[model samples]
Target: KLLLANWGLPKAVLEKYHSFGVKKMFEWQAECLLLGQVLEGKNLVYSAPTSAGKTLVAELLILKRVLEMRKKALFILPFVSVAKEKKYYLQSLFQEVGIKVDGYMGSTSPSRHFSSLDIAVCTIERANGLINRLIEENKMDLLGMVVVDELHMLGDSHRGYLLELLLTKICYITRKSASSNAVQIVGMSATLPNLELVASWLNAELYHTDFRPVPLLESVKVGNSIYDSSMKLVREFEPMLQVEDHVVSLCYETICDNHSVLLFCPSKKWCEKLADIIAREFYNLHHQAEQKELLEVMDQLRRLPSGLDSVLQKTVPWGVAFHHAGLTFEERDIIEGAFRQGLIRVLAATSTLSSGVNLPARRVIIRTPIFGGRPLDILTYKQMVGRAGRKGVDTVGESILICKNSEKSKGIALLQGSLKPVRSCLVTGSMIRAILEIIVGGVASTSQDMHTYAACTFLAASMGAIEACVMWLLENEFIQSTEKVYHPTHLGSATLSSSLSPADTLDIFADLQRAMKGFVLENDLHILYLVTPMFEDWTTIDWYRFFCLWEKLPTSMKRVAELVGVEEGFLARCVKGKQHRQMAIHKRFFTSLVLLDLISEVPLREINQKYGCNRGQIQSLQQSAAVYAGMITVFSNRLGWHNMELLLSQFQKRLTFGIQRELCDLVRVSLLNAQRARVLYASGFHTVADLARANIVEVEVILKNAVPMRTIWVTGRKGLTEREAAALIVEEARMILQQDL
Candidate 1:
């Protein structure tokens, strides 16, 4: 019978699973769970297609270990959204059994105590930091297992190195401490082609299957014709449709059958453009029920402090919406939820949506099988198509790629290509960064120790690579050699604390030195420039606006610019379309200007109008700058630059709230935005403690009138009502005050 209870799970766990409609396990899930000696505490590396019950098997193991072994489990997911969603799900599931689940993501740190948390869910970087802290505190034994979702992220160019470094440390530490119980490492991914290699790297038992709960049908759409993998024509769009656009035809066909479609666009602009087109064409397709449901979603977006996107406000009523990082979290949350509930029939999103969240669809459409002028890889293609069908909600899934006649061969290849093997990213990307991190975290101190640690990594980094890194580290003064042992300098420790690449750290270091020689204590422009991230893409620089903003800068701001070497000659060259050296410096400076406007309480709409940037990108920039600023603060503190540290620290808090200096304290309350903070400040609730004691009705009325058409009440039982939200605000304030006491 394959019943969950028939397995060794507890009654409460079984009931929880059943409550969520998971009464029985798939045969592959059962077989994989039992074959790996998982119940005996062996490590596991498993691969299966999407929606194949992989997470369920891992959840069972996590519960077993935590309940019986009395050790906490760490679940590492790729993105903040998925991490939060999983944390909420696990918290609910384990609440009946008394297991505390806490999730940590960007800028949010969990209170340190193994006894307080039975499970910890976090993003990749946060998980790495948590592991480092556990090892440093000699508390690795308290961690029973580490579950890494989307294990193939180890090959990602940007953040993959961190995941490899994290796993390598855990493996090495556990191996060295043979007397202690080893931390069970569980990695799950659907696109792993070299399962044996990764399993061997972790010393884990391997499990592989191609099983999917919902079967997915793959095909290509060319000029309204649908062709299967073997170039056999299967279907065609209706001849009478008003619009012949591929996206519209596909989405309209799916909606006609009462199924939701997810279309992947390559860029944010393309996503919005396609959504608007589809919305205009499909305005008549939405039934009364869907329109009513979408109205509620639109209301939800309106209720957000950030307000609704002008574009979304138009498209959402027709059961279409776009999703991207440029949108605020609250905005994206409503869109994702609306799509999941079948209220939005067509969701246009970027590729990031595929791996970042769990929203599924009946039909998946890829507008292009290429990114950055390169053909999409097999792994990415699979991830995009994998969202086609969801278990229980869908019995079958379908995916189609819309391609031009010239690119037909490329699309076909992508549909049939095998997934590439996952590899270590540290080989070329950040060997020095990895080495420094190892040394700073106390995992290695000597030459021999470094090689031993390298061997623990999936790369098993070559001796030559390690040698070059050591030489560079020594030359850069990141480390000093005393005899055969090495010790990290303060600068080295600060680089690691900043969580930035070695090259960027060096750049920032030089920039900081120049600034400290004659610090700009007058305005925030210079300080903001220093904290801006090194990796922001600014190739889309509106040179006209750039020069205009530069021309209008105050003398103080211009003076700060000169100190930082941003001369008018270079600005003129940039405006003239002439390429120049140190382009990154110019880009960072431009970003700082946008950020400066944001922190000065300039409205987002006006900022968009002034900079020609999308609202989504502007908000995204704010969030990224906030995180980068916090990193710089830590870096400065580690380097013993107390003045720089204090300035950066205070500004980091201010940036997080996106408010002026005076409202920083009031914005610390949960659910408070910049506008709310300003209102509370002007109303005499200047601090968290004051808000805690304010009359609830008065405060509620004040907040209710702060924004136009703001729905103070949450529309459903799922969220706090107007009065309830106000009460919770006060409660949160009291909690903060009590903590202070």
Candidate 2:
């Protein structure tokens, strides 16, 4: 009956789906939607091969939860660009039926979007923030359903801890709070072997199938011969590119068929290098001369907020581009959109293409067997292979593993290694904070209560040694504090509310005290550097990442690094056996130099060159600095360090506009660059009110000498009279200030 039914969806929906070429459901989609729905309010964890319509399967329930049940729903994804991509995808589907949809990530405030949104899509970190806010407000009852896409990410080491903590707490609050009803969670994964563990953890019924609508022909290349998974030779290609690497030539073979290829490389540097090689071969990056839509995509790409860096500027025009974390969020958005719309011919990318991004390339070329400076695991290699072709679109997809003749056995082994089980990678080291939060939140009152709730965690259930975690928290005064009730000390409360780890917050608090005791009076730069470590998220700084940034700091920052007492070239200077913790401390202080450069208005490209820190890190640091300013300011007020707070506020202003204090007031009002701000200050347009009152001719005279026409074009280009430009400046400033409040 379920298979014969339309899953109870409406006629218009069916007609529209058919119009888009999805005339009927795939078997796996039908099973997940109809059969999985029989479980109703229980959780569901399903695993199938990639491109088996997993996300589309989850979308059905998301609509059902919001449209049919009339309850709010949350969709948690892993990446910002992925969140944005789905926002458009889901919003369109919901729009025809009068359902409202909105998305939230760190860049935009949820307050702006969540008001009218029936279904919200966001990243795990943002969802973490939202859940914490709900817990604090005692309003955990509102969530009707939560769907976690790419559920196999529970095995990810970098982000899995956060995801683990989020799931544990969500499970905790829903059970502990009396007002709350059960929240249905549907987790979708790609060919995971351990859906049972996830289902057991969430009390969910398992629904899994290994069906693939489009058969994938997996192959390996050794010395010009392309062999199938069984080692039978399929095809051969002569080298096309100048280099010994056959990837470009193989990529040429595939893209010549007029189907897109998602070429995966290991590094951003290599991605750019390969994109250039491929773009040179791809036809000025377009086949048809009159493909005018590409120009529009190029226009959007150029107008990105991160601005056109050398890589995007050079590679994007050729219809070939590289995608990595180094690209800014806005750049990522534009590039992903362009690639999906067929504007890009060959997208040479890192694993940013893997994981969650929807790059439905006809050919998937595995250019390297490495990721993050390590050999790729079997599961990861399979993920790249899985993204090759779309169901009902490409008749067959090809996964090409580039290899040497000597490595033939290894290549086939990897191809056959799809059997690797998806194991839980939950860590308890950091969730001590979450446990303390649970304690202070009064959901778990005693240590035994904490243990009782923690029992539900995959970490505690399967792998993690929670005793060591309890011991760690015991030392922090975050555990076993009372005869009647085990509650956190003020330190725990400060760390939790401040959104800092016990380790990071305590160090930052102590270091700030030490820095203040011997505070530099003149350099607000030093004070601003200290602010980056404190944040609204408890995640620690990736100090291992700061190594390259510290190594290649600009001379100006290098001068200040020693001024700030950081070791110069410490990576080289340190002994072989140096403790990483101490080295990380050295790196933390080393980061002061980078922040010094930041507040100095060093061009992001220059800083990115001076240090290997990407545009993403600079953007992250900028946003974090903004949040840190408030966090530190709050703590300083609490600690009664008024003088330190004063110093921080002044430096914070420098961070806001990336200029000195003298121009802060002017930059605050004008849509001006640092150079223009300085020039305006020198020209004596001192304040917003002063500029508003300036003579039109005099303001125009100053502007004519100040910058170029294109510079201020975003504010309507510089030909405006004082009345219009100043009025616009005042309006922009008012909006920024209102958002700040």
Candidate 3:
């Protein structure tokens, strides 16, 4: 082994590492590890560009700890998908040495609680939960190392607060160690404008590098003109298909050069529409394995309960698909995987995907420069464009910012500007919940204890957001001062256990009690509508359609013209939710209307058409419905209403599996989703017992496509018979629902 046999990298990793044509490590990859300093569990923080061999450097250190020291390691990633990906890679190497590596998230069952998993890949949220779980069990000191990826997210508006809080607790754990052994922490970031300050905040040694294996080129498209980085016209592309719009035409040029293009759309609607435009314009364009992979993706979608409504089901065949918050995780998985495999050539996604993920594409197109009435920052722009050139894939990566004529120069200037500062965004509304989390979970015990944890965070250290949160928590009774010592109240304990903010927990309980006002049938919708406002920007509603259905659907909306302490008209306020919108009365009603369909038996397709929403939007709506149902379930538990508890339990399951009450039983047959549950009922196997006794002919005929091909390999060839598949399905159902539930 020419490279790392002496540096303590596991043998299996080096076998895979050489495939990248590297016989030895890059300078930074080996610098800290060569002296065995990083492997000895000293902290290492690297500020570098995307794909600048950071993964290798990080990987070697992780393997060293697991193989040599037998210490546990945690990788806190920004997204679950990344956690899954890293786990896949780590398992291959770790398994060779008999050390286990697994990923944990909200939906997945946590593996760490039962066994000593050497490494755990987690999203920040899950990391918070697992850490809380461990500390609750008085095992916080057992955590050996924590590696925070996407470290620059400490300044993100959406998740920065959580990141800072987690780090503060982690650093606290490291500093207060009673064991002679120490904790290892490695914070990595691809784009941090102010690394020195971040490094200081994390209290780790910083290794800053400007090294990128493959460089990126930033160009701009103004009207129909294209310019290079230096105010020079660049004519490097040739058109593959003639199109009217400049962005689409430029996209045509990207594919013409045998390159895939990753285009960032402004919104879900725009992404869907852009995919349609591209699909129509490139109807005849050819993609490798397009027919086969597109068929697979479509078939996969077709099998899901809400699959047919997906726009990707149609546009994927034409070499395009959309990705955004609206699409389900499974759909995103299919689209992202297929694009990299050359089945889909053009991927139109939101800027969320722009955050340092290894998306496959040679030419990167920013079709929408402005998002939600605001211009994207230079850091975001750089991150999106950095997705251009990929190491060992393309020799050069070219990213073109597609801008309007009105903002062409502005776009160019912004794209080329220095990145802004990465300041703390920790003191937001949810800060108290996180602050309260540590205190309730034993990371902090007293009010002063809470303040001490807060002071260690970037938010508290750089500024004074911690003091405000401390006062807010105390005044709100999340924690109280008794005998000059502090701890959680019963509600405070419930708040932490539920993993919800104090404000929302209080809002939900109080709102539901008020809306009940002695409890009415119509009060459910009001209660649901009440909880919807706890979140921001409630979805748009079709007031006209809703009112039209007022007589048709009384269960959905009440016939109220006026109410005390309510605004925007009675029914309007009921549907408009908590956030202000410039939309008309009808436009804001979509949210409550959607929640109605969750409880009803209305098909999602009809709901989509009714709401004027796309197929993917149902996923988002379903998630909200599921979460709302869960909150109510929790609320019912607190109220000791067993009847309401059962009701909301079934309601939550329906939203989670996206099925009506009837199919809920059918889907319980293990492998059967809602779409296939209908097939079983259609075939007259109306119950689980009937399905289990189904003959081979019936299974091969009625459930022909229901079972996956891989199942056939379990028994002999000839594929699984109807009875065998049915038995497995029934057993699985029993396993999932009988004892599991």
Candidate 4:
């Protein structure tokens, strides 16, 4: 009877599941599995807090695809880093079940393509690029199941636009091939406000749960804090000297006591500093161990520095490392590997590293004021703290905040005390424009077709009520309408098609087309002044130069814009202020100084040494010189020949353009500031274009609310009255309008 009963089951069959020594599943996991299986055919959105077994749900679906249906599965991650990490983990688990998996990320070699694997893991960027290539070749039916991890990042402006475009394209391609086989899409996120709304937009089923296996214990540091041993009060410790030194010491001690620690810092620089300090302290202690136990201590010390080369002299009982974007992929991989093996005791990382990575620490230390440039969102703060506890790994997780002042103390309390709901914000107009361009111009046939597809987006589903207001315009034939669907009319299409963003397309077109008749070079300048506030760094310069030159010479504007594949108006805006006689003088001096710096950095003697009289090298040098001469000639024409000559003479032997410590530092600071400005200005207040259109008072109010006024003032110029600032802002708006014309 027993033999017959065993024979009835298929190969590798068991009477009951063999649990891998794991405890019971969290409520989120149980709910996810139930909902995921029930909603198999349709798309599904899963949202929960970070490290809450979201990947396990994905794993269950993978099993269904490979074991049950024997279909191929595709897993998409927000970043290549995350994809690589997940791929390794999944590969190990799948191997245990006698399954093979493949990866398709930037790092994957072409030779690996031949080996047949059941599953494929790829970054969204890589996947999107491949999708575009496949669509071009008319071979879209490649995968059976598609999983998108970190779906919330799709709401980002720059990257999110591409993700949205990719999602739209995927939907279109899958629908076209729906008859052949249906492609399942599973989106996973932590703390997205409107999972249902996202599902409705994607036309998928939504599944959500906030259950965590380990209950969180939250507290805030009160007054001037110190590390106090009191069960009743979880004190926030803030020491006077180096904040990192104190935190690293505390974490190192905790890790030595056989507890894993995760220390969160605001920036990459601070993370590195803390890692260095901790590793050094730990290594020195390990070195003093008895000679008989030296080898064991040395092995521990070897792993203490993680990837840092400077601290190799001593070993530590506790391992230390830092996580951030600046570190190389190999470095991070090594650190994560060591940590997973229980060799690394403590990790110092930036806030971003806390999201969804598998590393779990017994204790989480929050160092300092908890300020992130602008007002820190409550959702992000909570998400950072969610990395503290791991179910089955540690009994209870502890969080310590180093608070220096009352403000810092209050900030910590607010973060710890709140479980504020996460909300989803719609993508901006610029994002819409970028995605539409990629889809309509790059993927689809026409604007109408793209608009038709865009209606299927989450934004559209969330704003269904607003869709009614525009129905009359469609009915009156002011805009294109097919059945109940509304789209851009011919004029609207032209306008939107011309815009840098889909939302601003119609408005920009209408405004610019009307202003074109009376537009002059000076008028262009006024417009540029209005729009300058909307752009950052080299972009501002590019726009200013393009507009100033183009307004005077329309044909030149169109020609250059075509070469760059940018709107003529955008190109025209860059050169607006350069046309002024006094401004020309100022630019000449600036250019001269820049050239002098470059010449000082890279001397002609060094160039000669590098070329070494080779024919190919000589030709290359000549070509480069010709290009430089041509550039100088254009500047001379725009500013003055005298100014050009002065700049060349000042910079002739300086070699300032090549490389220098000071120059490199200057570039680094400038680039960082520019990035911060772009983030603040672009997503900072509505969008860049919106800021251009807003008045000084309105702009100031927005800036004040988002960031300090001093920061805003430093972003542009100083000492301007409110009225003057408003006038300047208006001028910038005019510039943007003229550029569009």
Preferred candidate (lDDT higher): 1 or 2: 1
Per-residue lDDT over 634-705 for candidate 4, one digit per residue giving the tens place of the 0 to 100 score = 323322335434433322111212322223222222111212222234434433355456555654443233
lDDT score, candidate 1, position 1: 46
Best by TM-score: 1
lDDT ranking from best candidate downward: 1, 2, 3, 4
Clash statistics: count for each candidate: 1, 0, 4, 45
Q: Candidates' lDDT values, in order? A: 0.76, 0.64, 0.63, 0.48
Per-residue lDDT, model 1, residue 353, is 83
Clashing pairs in 2: none
TM-score computed on alpha carbons, candidate 4? 0.54
RMSD of candidates 1 onward, in order: 3.2, 7.0, 5.8, 19.4
Q: Which is the better candidate, 3 or 4, if ranked by lDDT? A: 3
Evaluate model 3: give its lDDT: 0.63
- Residue-by-residue lDDT tens digits, candidate 1, 1-741: 477777777677678787888876899888888894777777888888776667887888888788788888899887766787888788778877888888766665554455587788888877776776676546777888889887787886577678888788888877777632478888788756687888888878898898888888898876767888887887775643544345677777777778899988888678888888888876544432265756777776775655788888788887788898677656776678767668888888887787776778999888886765788878777777887787787788998887886787887898778888777766354667667777876766777877887787777732157777688788888887788788878888777766777887887788777777877878898889987775356336787778888889898888877777778777845457743446677787788888888889887767777988866677666766787787788878878889888788777766766888887777777567667677778887777768888898887787666664224433112334567777877887888876555
TM-score of 1: 0.91
TM-score of each: 0.91, 0.76, 0.80, 0.54
